[PDB]
Ligand binder design. Structure first.
Ligand SMILES: O=P(O)(O)OC[C@H]1O[C@](O)(COP(=O)(O)O)[C@@H](O)[C@@H]1O
Ligand SMILES: O=P(O)(O)OC[C@H]1O[C@](O)(COP(=O)(O)O)[C@@H](O)[C@@H]1O
Ligand SMILES: O=P(O)(O)OC[C@H]1O[C@](O)(COP(=O)(O)O)[C@@H](O)[C@@H]1O
Ligand SMILES: O=P(O)(O)OC[C@H]1O[C@](O)(COP(=O)(O)O)[C@@H](O)[C@@H]1O
Ligand SMILES: O=S(=O)(c1ccc(O)c(O)c1)c1ccc(O)c(O)c1
Ligand SMILES: O=S(=O)(c1ccc(O)c(O)c1)c1ccc(O)c(O)c1
Ligand SMILES: O=C([O-])C(=O)[O-]
Ligand SMILES: O=C([O-])C(=O)[O-]
Ligand SMILES: O=C([O-])C(=O)[O-]
Ligand SMILES: O=C([O-])C(=O)[O-]
Ligand SMILES: [K+]
Ligand SMILES: [K+]
Ligand SMILES: [K+]
Ligand SMILES: [K+]
Ligand SMILES: [Mg+2]
Ligand SMILES: [Mg+2]
Ligand SMILES: [Mg+2]
Ligand SMILES: [Mg+2]
Lengths: 422, 425, 425, 436
């Protein structure tokens, strides 16, 4: 029964053609949904009660669109998101962190506009986790956003939105200085011929997967759900294909900001992403990612490849990793393991930000500290296992891969262990 | 010899990539498509696309197959639609550069446990009016296809039966249905109601893959550009859906309400044409050909053996086209199953085969009406030169180009066994 | 039949990985194909008798090597006369006649920087006596090949020059030497003294790989069955060395003392024949063909395009042979470079080309002696029928087999452009 | 180039020109052959073990010391010749020569002793002389038995029974010498510790032109099973009377290594020939060149794909460690092992990194020579009170010995493989350590 679920016959296929032939509508997804859902906050999704339903439906990142509304309006949205998120903190083994992303208005006819400088300062003051920088055309646009965030906003992730021909052409220099990319198909589809957007999307997703940096697919993914309870056949296909392309995140704009079915739009993206993740041809994907990732003398990078290889060998239910900044989890995620990457962290910001990386499930550690560092590490590992058991990721008898470091502090991951559950 | 500009167009850098990941990384929005659009467009005929003048614009925009939806309208209404399609098609018989055969497909109302009384009557109407294809609704098992085949009476055995897979049973019994059908339609509308909507993409990709493996045509249908029923431009999900259906391996893409009742029927056809052209150049032929080659069983059929040799030869020299002489369309279909980048120009004396080969990706039919030569080898040479001259006229070919020519050793269907490399003069 | 798929290591040939290919190799799977790697036998006191040469031709000797390091011009002229007498003793049966090439192996430069005066005289002797091939000793750079070509003069333009790589400089300047040579000999004797003995296998494997990539013949030479100079059976290392040279991709394997001075020249030829046959069936064609196709550059030459189409067609149908008409041997060489499992039966009127194509693996030359038919198409057909009848007599073909036939559109060399699938009747 | 650019800038272009690294990074096997370079020097320690047959030409203690220095890893006693008294003296001389280097534990090289049986002769199974010789082997503490003419699984069970309860730790390597052994190979391999391709008798029992097929098939199946395979007979035959081998002989040795053989053997070349030390030196030189010419890119991919999914933590850790070693061009993989099993599971994936196996078992240290690329280090120190400290001391012993023997330099990355509790069977940890 195990080998009939999660498209495992299609996953073992010798060719991509045979993989397609073996895809089965009766093969149920079992793994937790890996691709994060970004929901745009607006009148249809601003109330605390509505936000609680969206968190339960699968929203991982709340997007604030600074193209509309005042700073007072957005501060209220942030407070409501935090209130809804913290209403589940009473049960630490099931608490789900939710990131807050600020999407800038953009340069308009102008580099960095004066309104963007003020909005970015607002983001730092209100503790946003991510900035979706509009109309990034070159590396200096990213540097300007980074400078406007100042010394207090050093830890904020900058996701550059590629929205025009210049951004596509200067993609490599933009990705090099950004934390990730958003394929902003709305403006891109007006700036370049609409029939060419899929080429830009597939290229950018492929280059971000190669670089090991997050990539978001955005705009009109479930557009008809703004007024209708069910999406069109092209919309479900678009969501599934963005996941199959390799997108780390998928986004909802008007569907959640102003539509009549915000919760249903989140549920639909969750349902499709789960089905599409199981249909990924891991046999070829892992081989190509493994071959393309350069040789490295960084122990975190070396441990990450060893751990993902070990996870595939034993059909590991999860890879439990201890991380301070999220980096060790990101390096595991870049190899696209089928095993869930359970990231145990003390940082609340890193727990929110790792939603940008596909297949990373953040667990915010709030248990009493241990006096012995080795005992403290072992307790965080057992915490990952208990949360994993409660959430359905793990069962007794499963094998897990555990990734830790040799000393406290970020940058010292160098150990991989094979552990049998219970 | 060809120029550096030649190797920058039609995603040739992405086509030469060593891995699928590198192929994606090399896709370029500035790399323009050059080849003719190979995925056929099926447009549903209705009030918005029934007039002769509107049909002429749709033919110019790229419509290859006219679909008659027998779920609505009387036999009198459909006979008028057929006459208007034929009038619009024949209005271009004067210009070889603009003339294009257009197939007529009858889409049945559907079942009841099996073939309904109305379907028997509608299928008889199709035979009497000379339709080329039947899109059989709600096919669930092999016996449903046999019933449709039996209903195509004594005169309609040459009509192609494309089984529409619309429910869980059709998906589960797919292999037995494909074995007896000429092709398949992934009817996503009903399929998305019969099975969970989030599972339709799995059924679509599986069926397209199995049809590509079998070498049989597969159509992707329903809501591909739905928003264009009221809006002049489609959504980002809709263009993505069309491009991904072509990348999946679909031979045909379809328009329903977009062309039958919408406000922008011609623009919907133009949009599918534009997207299919871009998506066909983005196909990763290096891995696709290797896998089709490996999956296709060994064969002692000379048409099958010649077809793979010809497609291999076309890739080796970047041939502008493969010109094939075919009476039934079968030799062109066997070339099409290996997905060559070269256009397959099919020269036939059969007007029905010329219309039906639109079901096969990359087949460009040319109907030949010259009187037969007394010396058979001369008749063959005249048809090969007709394909070359039409190719030059239409932009497929130029003097100095290499073309692959596929012919047989004797007259009659079933004897294809020759592949030649010709330099265009 | 099921028995067909158990022979010639067909289970190992269909394997998905090289490891699984090795695991499926079967000592009970009998070779069926004709032996495709040519055997070069060096002539000497043990192999000069006309009666002894007839037995060596029957055992499988394809090329007779004259070592100009020993003997005078008078000695070599007698060797040539004896070889020709033994070869021509079988000309009374044209369907079974086996051409045998004559190769002149030069003494070398010695302490000199380039072409020695003795080599100039020996090369002129070769042209005057009609030798087919020159094995040029100690080639260190492209100008050494040009000097050999100049010494052959205008009358020796058709002689093939195979450069012997015997030292570090020849290995380092390999690419420039191969570019101007017709082929290469891995002369392991001197190479093993000039460079550390433990590194010779790396030079052998590299040169064979680069010659296979270039589509040019490569010979493996020296001490392959050394112990057979005095013993009736070779050592385990010797049979392994012959099998591995064939698996590496060598077009030819050579015997020196084993045939020139030993006590078992006929048995040494028979042993190389037996081993080469076993090793050719053990070649992993699935990966080899894929890599040769991918590495071979795109081409606009119709002979090159037809060759890859014909090899692909031959693999698709398990063709027993590819029958090719050739004037210079070039069309057969271009088929051979893709390493088909099907025998390449080359029909030619040129006695020299028939002898020289033994340099290319899997090419079986048939010398056609009949004067041309008045109708060129009938002369082409008669030559193809001669290939089929010789093939049937020699066991290459049976009724019911499929064969690929490679011809051109006009008389004269350079116009091959047609591939046809033919059933043997 | 993008996949190796940063590491090329860090380690230098000279590093990437050595040990056939350009040929190792090739995208196809054809390109791998085209990139093989006679100027690309081998750097890694020789990983294929050399088995030398002991006889009159290689019996003296002083001669044996030269053969150990030349590279002999396993001493073979051919029980087809000589009495029990003769073989006991050979064993004592081998042990005396081996122990003459024990004064320096950081450089001491263990040498295994293998007993090669006379065989069944005309009989259907285990002969009475073989039963007596096998009992002699157990009494004299031999490490390995090369069982002659194994034709079926019951032949190896008979050898195992003749070894008795005291010989349970002895490795049984079945010699495949006839058609029946080749045809029943899978059942023989399943119950054996490894295989020997005995080409001498095999070449008489089956047509000589078919021996290479049997050799390549058996080596491939042993590599797939992760069990040692020995290539034997006439590898450097001419060196019995001549100082240099023929071109076919060097080719045969190189091709046995490229085929995937864990061990290569010398028979008459060492036992009775005129150049025993030179024959060992020649096999050493060729094996080093051939190991660097192995196409690891395809080999690792195929071993990974063919090896079934596993829930055994030693197996899971082994593939993770070999993958990690390739990622960083690790100089070595240091593994703690009691029976040799954790080192054998690393060896089956054919890493380019040397597998330095630290063990307290003198027998396991000798027996791991059967596995390609395993360098045994015998740890003689008594256990620390705290088990975690005892583990760390053993790892440090491997690093210090690795530095001493030239395997490791400061700045190198090393992969360390250990377990969560004492005793055999609990390996489950992989660590990436930077050498300081
Ligand atoms: O992913 P990051 O940011 O490098 O953090 C990984 C770090 O986490 C640890 O596993 C635990 O460290 P702390 O005890 O400081 O939380 C370290 O050993 C390791 O260096
Ligand atoms: O594709 P089909 O229907 O098999 O037709 C292919 C046939 O066309 C030809 O090339 C030309 O035949 P006709 O002259 O009868 O049209 C035949 O030699 C070949 O058998
Ligand atoms: O292999 P080559 O030397 O190019 O010769 C091939 C030539 O042989 C032919 O098949 C037959 O030519 P001939 O009639 O002159 O022998 C030509 O059509 C073709 O050009
Ligand atoms: O390779 P083997 O025979 O399984 O031995 C590996 C064992 O060695 C160790 O690393 C150390 O164990 P010891 O302390 O008993 O020597 C164990 O943790 C592990 O189980
Ligand atoms: O799943 S894959 O192996 C694959 C292969 C061939 C195809 O045509 C295809 O659509 C998908 C894959 C996907 C994304 C990658 O970036 C990659 O490296 C591999
Ligand atoms: O037969 S092969 O596919 C092969 C693959 C892997 C091996 O390790 C091997 O020894 C042989 C091959 C491929 C290309 C060649 O140019 C060749 O000579 C052989
Ligand atoms: O701003 C965006 O997200 C867009 O334009 O697609
Ligand atoms: O009938 C159709 O086309 C459907 O259901 O999608
Ligand atoms: O000349 C030769 O043949 C050699 O050196 O091997
Ligand atoms: O017994 C042996 O070692 C042989 O036959 O090779
Ligand atoms: K915005
Ligand atoms: K209908
Ligand atoms: K010579
Ligand atoms: K013995
Ligand atoms: Mg925008
Ligand atoms: Mg329907
Ligand atoms: Mg020489
Ligand atoms: Mg024996």
């Amino acid at each position: 029964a195990f080998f009939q679920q999660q498209q495992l016959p299609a996953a073992m296929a010798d060719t991509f053609l045979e993989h397609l032939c073996l895809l089965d509508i009766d093969s149920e997804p079992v793994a937790a949904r890996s691709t994060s859902i970004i929901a745009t906050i607006g009148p249809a999704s601003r109330s605390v009660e509505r936000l609680k339903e969206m968190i339960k439906a699968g929203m991982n990142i709340a997007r604030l669109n600074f193209s509309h509304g005042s700073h007072e309006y957005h501060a209220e949205s942030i407070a409501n998101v935090r209130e809804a998120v913290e209403s589940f903190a009473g049960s630490p083994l099931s608490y789900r962190p939710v990131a807050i992303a600020l999407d800038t208005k953009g340069p308009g006819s102008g580099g960095l506009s004066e309104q963007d400088v003020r909005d970015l300062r607002f983001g730092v003051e209100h503790g946003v986790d991510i900035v979706f920088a509009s109309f990034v055309r070159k590396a200096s646009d990213v540097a300007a956003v980074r400078a406007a965030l100042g010394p207090e906003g050093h830890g904020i992730k900058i996701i550059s939105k590629i929205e025009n021909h210049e951004g596509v052409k200067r993609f490599d220099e933009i990705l090099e200085v950004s934390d990730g990319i958003m394929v902003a198909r709305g403006d891109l589809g007006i700036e370049i011929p609409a029939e060419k957007v899929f080429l830009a999307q597939k290229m950018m997703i492929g280059r971000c997967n190669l670089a090991g940096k997050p990539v978001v697919c955005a705009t009109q993914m479930l557009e008809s759900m703004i007024t209708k309870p069910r999406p069109t056949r092209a919309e479900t296909s678009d969501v599934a294909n963005a996941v199959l392309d390799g997108a780390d995140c998928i986004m909802l704009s008007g569907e959640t900001a102003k539509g009549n079915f915000p919760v249903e739009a989140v549920k639909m993206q969750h349902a499709i992403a789960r089905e599409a993740e199981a249909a990924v041809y891991h046999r070829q994907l892992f081989e190509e990612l493994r071959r393309a990732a350069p040789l490295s003398r960084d122990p975190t990078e070396v441990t990450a490849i060893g751990a993902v290889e070990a996870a595939f060998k034993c059909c590991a239910a999860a890879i439990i990793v201890l991380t301070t900044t999220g980096r060790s989890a990101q390096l595991l995620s870049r190899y696209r393991p089928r095993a869930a990457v359970i990231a145990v962290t003390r940082s609340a910001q890193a727990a929110r930000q790792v939603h940008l990386c596909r297949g990373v499930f953040p667990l915010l550690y709030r248990e009493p500290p241990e006096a012995i560092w080795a005992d403290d590490v072992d307790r965080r590992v057992q915490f990952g296992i208990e949360s994993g058991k409660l959430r359905g990721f793990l069962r007794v008898g499963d094998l897990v891969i555990v990734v830790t470091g040799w000393r406290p502090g970020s940058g010292y991951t160098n150990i991989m262990r094979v552990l049998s559950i219970s």
